[PDB]
Amino acid sequence: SYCNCLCRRGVCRCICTI
């Protein structure tokens, strides 16, 4: 339903949910 893939301040957590 959504995709949250990005980085910032070391919070680089590339993922992707429905």
User: Which residues make Cβ contacts (< 8 Å) with residue 12, sequence separation at least 6?
Assistant: 6
The pair phi, psi for residue 8, each rounded to 5°, is 180, 125
- Token pair listed for 13: 């957590």
Q: What is the 3-state secondary structure (H, E, C) of the chain?
A: CECCCCCCCCCCCCCCEC
- Token pair listed for 17: 């949910």
Rounded to a whole number of angstroms, the CA Rg of the chain reads: 8
